[PDB]
């Protein structure tokens, strides 16, 4: 178990000051905060926990207020006494998801420095795919110990308690164990993180410095016009009604716009061919093939998409606005992807359609406050630029070197014709090939995205590898070391472990071969992006210009910049991104500005 004996509950200044003194000479210490809510900007600190050594940890309750809650040190007094320590860059702290913690402190004008070790990130850099990187999963894996779960002390469902309603001693068992367990996890993982200079570098210079930048980006939030969102909502109801009428009008009677039920009984029953089309999907979409001549499938296609988008963003978004800030604060996840790229949720900015008009309207709702503008800094096909570098191809490298559209250069060489004459269908065939390589796409998969016959696709790829031989080598070389060492790495050292590389299973090992070729390019993009955020954020913190970094999505960073400052700030973001990262990959940053995210994008 864990009883009231394990950890102390600090209820008086004299004891806190005693701990503070010990904390000041500890080589590194684990620190934690407990709040009344998951919402960072509006949560109130209910208490703090520390651990100076395994088994030696304490819980400092400051704001429990249930009926008859014992006297506690006031939140204001505990913070003023703890502030010097917390803001000391020299006092090294350890924690699980320090991002959340740094933010809560910032609610009180305290700047958490010495953000040295985050056990979540230690775990993530050691092996991103080992499993879940949360403390409960970690403790069970490295310490064969099952931690006290939040549900165990608070409950479940709607009648779940908030931390401030939990008895002091129960609150302490949970809090103090978090502190203690975190320290123990660091003591086991930190040594391991040193057997390799690759992972080490990434964790030290990329992941750790990013913890406070993510916090600031999350807390800053993004201004969303709910009116716009609402109009778009009303209009999408009218358009969904019209499309339903247009579907009924093409044939007869009423029916749902669901395949393998109401569509097949119409579509093929009135000529076409039997099978359906899955919503597997991004490889064979029977519905959009007919769409070139057939009208009905076209309207069902465009219908579903609009219905998805409406409930996903148009209806969801306005409800995410925070009463306290009046802005939306998305959740970025640093230890979730296998390759190392930041993911996002509530909302998942990365699922907002790009090459589609309706997604563009979603983006128009992402607006700049009065006297400011949204500025978009993007890494133009950074992953393609990464592949050129990693494959040491003079062709590709030169295409970018002289500012040429790699898709048209590629086709100009693959199809053998002048660059100014390359057709849209050729540029489109080249691009399908270019992008297929990154994802390690099969010659048949390429045939499925391009709609050409098999072996016709195999013809194109053969021509590609002969004109760009350095790419075949890279591809093979990567599938080689991936089998040998069981992992692949990015330019900075980040690793992706491939456990099924020698699987003995067919498709499971194929997946591992695709991930192998892919990860090095994606992971490197991720590293480049993280390094850029740190760099730009460092300029922001030091120089304090009139700019806020508000989003990170795909290969772009989004800001709000003062309208009178646009030019000088844009020159700067441009230099920080294409120069203060990796000087080995030929990078290009496209900077745009507007009144909303769509205008700058």
Q: Name the site residues for Zn ion (rule: CB under 5 A).
A: 32, 178, 496, 498, 515
Cα–Cα distance between 461 and 31 in angstroms, integer? 54
Nearest to Zn ion of 454, 508 (CB atom): 508
Q: Smallest gap, in angstroms, from Cβ of residue 509 to Zn ion?
A: 11
Nearest to Zn ion of 112, 515 (CB atom): 515
Nearest to Zn ion of 91, 498 (CB atom): 498
Nearest to Zn ion of 147, 426 (CB atom): 147
Q: Smallest gap, in angstroms, from Cβ of residue 120 to Zn ion?
A: 10
Q: Smallest gap, in angstroms, from Cβ of residue 396 to Zn ion?
A: 25
Half-sphere exposure of 593 (CA within 13 A, CB side): 20
Within 10 A of 494 (CB to CB), how many other CB atoms are there?
A: 27
Q: Smallest gap, in angstroms, from Cβ of residue 4 to Zn ion?
A: 17
Cα–Cα distance between 401 and 395 in angstroms, integer? 10
User: Phi and psi (nearest 5°) for 234?
Assistant: -60, -40
Nearest to Zn ion of 365, 498 (CB atom): 498
Q: Which residue has the tokens 């606005």?
A: 321
Cα–Cα distance between 223 and 231 in angstroms, integer? 17
Dihedral in degrees, nearest 10, Cα atoms 104, 106, 109, 110: 90
Half-sphere exposure of 292 (CA within 13 A, CB side): 5
Q: Specify whether the CB–CB gap between 579 and 588 falls below 8 A.
A: no
Element (H, E) at 115: strand 115-118
Q: Smallest gap, in angstroms, from Cβ of residue 406 to Zn ion?
A: 27
Nearest to Zn ion of 340, 470 (CB atom): 340
**Is the CA virtual torsion 126, 128, 134, 139 positive or negative?**
negative
Encoding tokens for residue 391? 């494959």
Using DSSP's 3-state secondary structure scheme, residue 48 falls into strand
Q: Specify whether the CB–CB gap between 95 and 82 falls below 8 A.
A: no
Q: Smallest gap, in angstroms, from Cβ of residue 512 to Zn ion?
A: 6
Nearest to Zn ion of 199, 359 (CB atom): 199
Q: Specify whether the CB–CB gap between 154 and 171 falls below 8 A.
A: no
Dihedral in degrees, nearest 10, Cα atoms 264, 269, 274, 276: -20
Residue 579 vs residues 345, 400, 531: alpha-carbon distances, Å: 30, 16, 11
Nearest to Zn ion of 175, 589 (CB atom): 175
Give residue number: closest CB to Zn ion: 178
Q: Smallest gap, in angstroms, from Cβ of residue 518 to Zn ion?
A: 9
- The number of residues in the chain equals 601
Q: Smallest gap, in angstroms, from Cβ of residue 497 to Zn ion?
A: 6
Encoding tokens for residue 264? 């097949």
Sheet with 56-61, side-by-side order of all strands: 8-9, 56-61, 45-53, 29-35, 93-95, 115-118
Q: Which is it for strands 45-53 and 29-35: parallel, antiparallel or unpaired?
A: antiparallel
Q: How far apart are the first and last CA of the chain?
A: 54
Q: Smallest gap, in angstroms, from Cβ of residue 514 to Zn ion?
A: 9
Instruction: Return the closest-CA partner of residue 589 out of 550, 539, 531.
Output: 531
Cα–Cα distance between 598 and 601 in angstroms, integer? 5
Q: Which is it for strands 115-118 and 93-95: parallel, antiparallel or unpaired?
A: parallel
Q: Smallest gap, in angstroms, from Cβ of residue 467 to Zn ion?
A: 30
Instruction: Return the closest-CA partner of residue 451 out of 434, 472, 429, 422.
Output: 429
Q: Where are the alpha helices (DSSP H) in 143-275?
A: 150-154, 168-192, 197-201, 208-220, 226-250, 264-267
Q: What is the 3-state secondary structure (H, E, C) of 257-320?
A: CCCCCCCHHHHCCCCCCCCCCCCCCCCCCHHHHHCCCCCHHHHHHHHHHHHHHHHHHHCCHHHH
- By CB neighbour count within 10 A (0-12 exposed, 13-18 middle, 19+ buried), where does 553 fall? buried
């Amino acid at each position: 178990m864990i009883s009231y004996d394990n950890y102390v509950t600090i209820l008086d200044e004299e004891t806190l000051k005693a701990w503070i003194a010990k904390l000041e000479k500890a080589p590194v210490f684990a620190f934690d905060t407990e709040t009344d809510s998951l919402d960072n900007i509006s949560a109130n600190l209910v208490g703090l926990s520390f651990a100076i050594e395994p088994g030696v940890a304490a819980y400092i309750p400051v704001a429990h207020d249930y009926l008859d809650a014992p006297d506690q040190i006031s939140r204001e007094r505990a913070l003023e006494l703890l502030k010097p320590l917390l803001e000391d860059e020299k006092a090294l702290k350890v924690g699980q998801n320090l991002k959340y913690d740094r933010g809560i402190l910032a609610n009180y004008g305290i700047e958490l420095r010495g953000i040295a070790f985050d056990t979540m990130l230690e775990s993530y850099i050691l092996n991103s795919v080992a499993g879940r990187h949360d403390m409960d999963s970690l403790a069970e894996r490295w310490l064969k110990h099952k931690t006290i779960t939040f549900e165990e002390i608070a409950g479940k469902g709607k009648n779940q308690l908030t931390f401030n309603q939990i008895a002091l001693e129960e609150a302490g068992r949970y809090a103090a164990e978090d502190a203690d367990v975190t320290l123990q996890l660091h003591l086991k993982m930190w040594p391991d993180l040193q057997k390799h200079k690759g992972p080490l570098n990434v964790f030290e210079n990329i992941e750790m410095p990013l913890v406070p930048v993510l916090s600031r980006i999350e807390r800053n939030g993004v201004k969303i016009d709910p009116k716009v969102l609402h109009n778009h909502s009303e209009e999408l109801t009218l358009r969904l009604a019209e499309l339903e009428k247009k579907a009924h009008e093409i044939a007869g009677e009423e029916f749902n716009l669901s395949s393998t039920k109401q569509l097949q009984t119409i579509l093929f029953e009135k000529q076409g061919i039997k099978p359906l089309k899955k919503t597997p999907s991004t490889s064979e979409e029977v519905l959009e093939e007919l769409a070139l001549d057939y009208p009905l499938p076209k309207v069902i296609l465009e219908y579903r998409g609009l219905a998805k988008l409406k409930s996903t963003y148009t209806d969801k978004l306005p409800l995410m606005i925070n009463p306290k800030t009046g802005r939306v604060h998305t959740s970025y996840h640093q230890a979730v992807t296998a390759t190392g790229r930041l993911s996002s949720t509530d909302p998942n900015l990365q699922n907002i359609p790009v090459r589609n008009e309706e997604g563009r309207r979603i983006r128009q709702a992402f607006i700049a406050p009065e006297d400011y503008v949204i500025v978009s800094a993007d890494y133009s096909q950074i992953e393609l630029r990464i592949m050129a570098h990693l494959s040491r191809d003079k062709g590709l490298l030169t295409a970018f070197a002289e500012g040429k559209d790699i898709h048209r250069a590629t086709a100009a060489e693959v199809f053998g014709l002048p660059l100014e004459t390359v057709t849209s269908e050729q540029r489109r065939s080249a691009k399908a090939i270019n992008f297929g390589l990154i994802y390690g796409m099969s010659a048949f998969g390429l045939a499925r995205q391009l709609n050409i016959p098999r072996k016709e696709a195999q013809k194109y790829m053969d021509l590609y590898f002969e004109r760009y031989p350095g790419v075949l080598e890279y591809m093979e070389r990567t599938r080689a070391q991936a089998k040998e060492q069981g992992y692949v790495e990015t330019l900075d050292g980040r690793r992706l472990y491939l456990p099924d590389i020698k699987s003995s299973n067919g498709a499971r090992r194929a997946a591992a071969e695709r991930a192998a070729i892919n990860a090095p390019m994606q992971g490197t993009a991720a590293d480049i992006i993280k390094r850029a955020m740190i760099a730009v954020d460092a300029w922001l913190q030091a120089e304090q210009p009139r700019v806020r970094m508000i989003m990170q999505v795909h290969d772009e960073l989004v800001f709000e910049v003062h309208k009178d400052d646009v030019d000088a700030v844009a020159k700067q973001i441009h230099q920080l991104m294409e120069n203060c990262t990796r000087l080995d990959v030929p990078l290009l940053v496209e900077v745009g500005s507007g009144e909303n995210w769509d205008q700058a994008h």
